[PDB]
């Protein structure tokens, strides 16, 4: 499970709750769109 | 219906209401002009 | 001890407390992800 296309448009909270369900060890990083990585 | 030229200059609210009428499944993303995509 | 991979996802406070334990002379700099260095 490496991607969540179904999360586009949902809030950070909803997204956090979905990813932690599928990937309990996830380290969630929240950045502004356009942040150069 | 892939573009809304008639929405230039209108507020985000007005724009949201117009697009959802024409495209009920739209996932609306609001970014600052100039955000590098 | 030049890196702390175990700190990804933790808060700045927790991170500060961990690094100072391992490296008492550390000068801690806190920047936004994407700051061009």
């Amino acid at each position: 499970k490496t991607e969540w296309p179904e999360l586009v448009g949902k809030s950070v909270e909803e997204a956090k709750k979905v990813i932690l369900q599928d990937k309990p060890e996830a380290q969630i990083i929240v950045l502004p769109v356009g942040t150069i990585v | 219906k892939t573009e809304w030229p008639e929405l230039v200059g209108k507020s985000v609210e007005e724009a949201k209401k117009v697009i959802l009428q024409d495209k009920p499944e739209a996932q609306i993303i609001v970014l600052p002009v100039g955000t590098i995509v | 001890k030049t890196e702390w991979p175990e700190l990804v996802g933790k808060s700045v406070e927790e991170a500060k407390k961990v690094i100072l334990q391992d490296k008492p002379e550390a000068q801690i700099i806190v920047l936004p992800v994407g700051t061009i260095v």
């Binding site: 490496t2 991607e3 990937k23 950045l31 769109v33 | 609001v30 | -």
Partner: peptide, 24 residues
């Protein structure tokens, strides 16, 4: 650095997910 346990969320001005989240 590819980190198998990290998930970056790129948010819009209203904090909605703007792009498809992926591990890395």
């Amino acid at each position: 650095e590819y980190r198998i346990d990290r998930v970056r969320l790129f948010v819009d001005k209203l904090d909605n997910i703007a792009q498809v989240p992926r591990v890395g």
